[PDB]
């Protein structure tokens, strides 16, 4: 019963196609609640979950001011980074940043996060002590020096221990009926014959929240990790998630195989066989 808030900043340049676009989205656990897009007609930080809508004008104005400013800062940053790698004016490049806090069941800060990537590659990350940086290369050492002089680490600690957890706690209470409700998955096993030799047993999990889940197949009580096929957990569009695990069994041996389902919304962990 622990929770997290994360913010995801994406800045993409597109030379010849206007100034770099800046996108920000806010998540509580696996629930998006705000977005900002500098490409929109009227750029504003916008609600994306009902429980944030009740917030008032000073809220939305602060979140829009900071995001509009970041739109400019992140453009300066994309330019600086192009410099640090001696990159041409012509290529497209991506700066990404994700940050936020983790709190336990009592609301106490478990740890903070701030990580940056450039063109998909780890660039700079705030260390778990919330007061020092890990730079991935000599380009990021420059950013480290700038942030050292700007005392950014202090600012992150104050935010990560302060507003982040306080507002997370405020969000968790205002959306308690969804953010603090775990919906267990609905499950079933299917059977798709392949040849006369073998068939596929597919274990399904549907409608669960949050997305964290464990689907495993056993043959005679022994886990089958090399032999199991897992889809990536996928969103259903209605806040819930879907997943499935498949295993190819010798035909006739289907009952030596069990599927086990671990999920927070489940009273007790599930064991399912194929029921023909």
């Amino acid at each position: 019963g622990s929770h997290s808030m994360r913010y995801f900043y994406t800045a993409m340049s597109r030379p010849g196609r206007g100034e770099p676009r800046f996108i920000a989205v806010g998540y509580v656990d696996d629930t998006q609640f705000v977005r900002f897009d500098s490409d929109a007609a009227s750029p504003r930080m916008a609600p994306r979950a009902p429980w944030i809508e009740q917030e008032g004008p000073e809220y939305w104005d602060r979140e829009t001011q900071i995001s509009k400013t970041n739109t400019q800062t992140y453009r300066e940053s994309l330019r600086n980074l192009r410099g640090y790698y001696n990159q041409s004016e012509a290529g497209s490049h991506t700066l990404q940043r994700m940050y936020g806090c983790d709190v336990g069941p009592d609301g106490r800060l478990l740890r903070g996060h701030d990580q940056s990537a450039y063109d998909g590659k780890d660039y700079i990350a705030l260390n778990e002590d919330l007061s020092s940086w890990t730079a991935a290369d000599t380009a990021a050492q420059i950013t480290q020096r700038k942030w050292e002089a700007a005392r950014e680490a202090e600012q992150w600690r104050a935010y990560l221990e302060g507003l982040c957890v306080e507002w997370l706690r405020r969000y968790l209470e205002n959306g308690k009926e969804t953010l603090q409700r775990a919906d267990p998955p609905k499950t079933h096993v299917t059977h798709h014959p392949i040849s006369d030799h073998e068939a596929t047993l597919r274990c399904w999990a549907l409608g669960f929240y949050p997305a964290e889940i464990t689907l495993t197949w056993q043959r005679d009580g022994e886990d089958q990790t090399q032999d199991t096929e897992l889809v990536e957990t996928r969103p259903a569009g209605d806040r819930t998630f879907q997943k499935w695990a498949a295993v190819v069994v010798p035909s006739g041996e289907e009952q030596r195989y069990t599927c086990h389902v671990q999920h927070e919304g489940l009273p007790k962990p599930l064991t399912l066989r194929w029921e023909p």
Binding site: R62, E63, E76, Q155, W156, C164
Partner: peptide, 9 residues
């Protein structure tokens, strides 16, 4: 709630 804008990279 987002962090206050910070220094460029």
């Amino acid at each position: 709630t987002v962090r206050a804008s910070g220094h460029s990279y």
